[PDB]
Design a binder for this molecule. Structure first.
Ligand SMILES: C[N+](C)(C)CCO
Length: 418
């Protein structure tokens, strides 16, 4: 007996809203990094770690959290993710004093742990609550909610918190409004989850879901699955290429304020708009994807073309940032974002034919973890190069790693159409 309950929209809306808030808090410091660097009296490296703790916490916690989801259930993961997102936000509101950077780092740490319960959720929520014809749309909608949070996180902080470095009293007042506004919204979404989020529908939405309930998986042996995946040569290549592409996006997002403010001083508002253009353009590219994969093309071909076009965009972005024209940075950011962040759902869909029998949870956990590892390596390396030699040295570093990703992409032997 398959039935569709009106609660699926409520569940999807609630998750996509507090998944939006989680991605908002990840980047809310980096887009105004020069504001927090002077307010907290720390170096730029301290602020970049407010964005890197999201990546660092994901790698060692993803698989224990995945085990929790498969054993306890969907509701507990939703409560923990939205609950920790709210709890971390309230800690940040208590750190609006100049000598309380470690308090906002502690609050950022709690938000980072919340993401482990959020980033892989869209696939589970879509399958559990939506029918066969709506699974892809529901999963894509929840995933895009995380990207929308990053786009909002680029735009709002430059508007909410102007760089009034000379008057620190108003600087603390503006930061309180952002932190209090975030925690108020995070608390509201936590309360809604505790009321409306449910373990499962009264009836299975899809025939596959009905069989899944009739076949309790019990254990899964992640260690067996993770070691069966590292013997798949195309998947190992896909793990590296996906991490490089997403890691470059993470590093560019973290250091976007540093590059723009190097040339265009006092351009925090436009820097926030540039990041919004990058993320929004790639959101459209994700929606347009699928139309890219025509009935003659394969996932491997589409991945190779997008990877090449993303690398070209990175080169064009690298050598146009020094031209002292903020307008072309908007155009180059949109072109770069259209391919760099529009690749994110493409890499996940390519890991379906490569990894057919093994559960999507392990492959998703590995692909996401690879992005976190590369994002840390890229942010640390590009940040070091930018702080010593300028934005061009850091941006050139990403292009070389993007070229390596092209070579590894072409070496994958896997042909299967849409
Ligand atoms: C997924 N985010 C882009 C929000 C951060 C990962 O570290």
């Amino acid at each position: 007996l398959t039935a569709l309950s009106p609660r699926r929209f409520v569940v999807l809306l609630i998750f996509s809203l507090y998944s939006l808030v989680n991605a908002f808090q990840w980047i809310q410091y980096s887009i105004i990094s020069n504001v927090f660097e002077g307010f907290y009296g720390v170096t730029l490296l301290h602020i970049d770690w407010l964005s890197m703790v999201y990546m660092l916490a994901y790698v060692p916690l993803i698989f224990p959290a995945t085990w929790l989801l498969d054993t306890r259930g969907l509701r507990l993961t939703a409560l923990l993710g939205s609950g920790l997102n709210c709890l971390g936000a309230w800690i940040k509101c208590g750190s609006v004093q100049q000598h309380l950077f470690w308090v906002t780092m502690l609050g950022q740490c709690l938000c980072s742990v919340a993401q482990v319960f959020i980033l892989g959720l869209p696939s589970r929520i879509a399958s559990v609550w939506f029918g066969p014809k709506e699974v892809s749309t529901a999963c894509a909608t929840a995933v895009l909610g995380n990207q929308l949070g990053t786009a909002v996180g680029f735009l709002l902080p430059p508007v909410l918190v102007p760089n009034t470095q000379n008057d620190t009293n108003l600087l603390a007042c503006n930061i309180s409004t952002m932190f209090y506004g975030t925690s108020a919204v995070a608390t509201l979404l936590f309360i809604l989850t505790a009321i409306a989020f449910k373990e499962k529908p009264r009836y299975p939405p899809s025939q596959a879901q009905a069989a899944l309930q009739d076949s309790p998986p019990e254990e899964y042996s992640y260690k067996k699955s993770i070691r069966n995946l590292f013997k798949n040569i195309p998947f190992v290549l896909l793990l590296i290429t996906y991490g490089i592409m997403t890691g470059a996006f993470y590093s560019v997002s973290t250091l976007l304020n540093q590059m723009i403010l190097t040339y265009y001083e006092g351009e925090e508002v436009n820097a926030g708009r540039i990041g919004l253009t990058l993320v929004v353009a790639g959101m459209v590219g994700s929606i347009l994807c699928g139309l890219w994969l025509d009935y003659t093309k394969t996932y491997k071909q589409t991945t190779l073309i997008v990877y090449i076009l993303s690398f070209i965009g990175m080169v064009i972005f690298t050598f146009t940032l020094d031209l002292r024209y903020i307008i072309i940075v908007f155009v180059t950011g949109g072109v770069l974002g259209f391919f760099m962040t529009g690749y994110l759902p493409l890499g996940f869909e390519f890991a379906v034919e490569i990894t057919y029998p093994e559960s999507e949870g392990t492959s998703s956990g590995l692909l996401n973890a690879s992005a976190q590892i590369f994002g840390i390596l890229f942010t640390l390396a590009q940040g070091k190069l930018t702080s010593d030699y300028g934005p061009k040295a850091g941006n050139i570093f990403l292009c070389v790693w993007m070229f390596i990703g092209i070579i590894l992409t072409a070496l994958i032997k896997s042909d299967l159409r849409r």
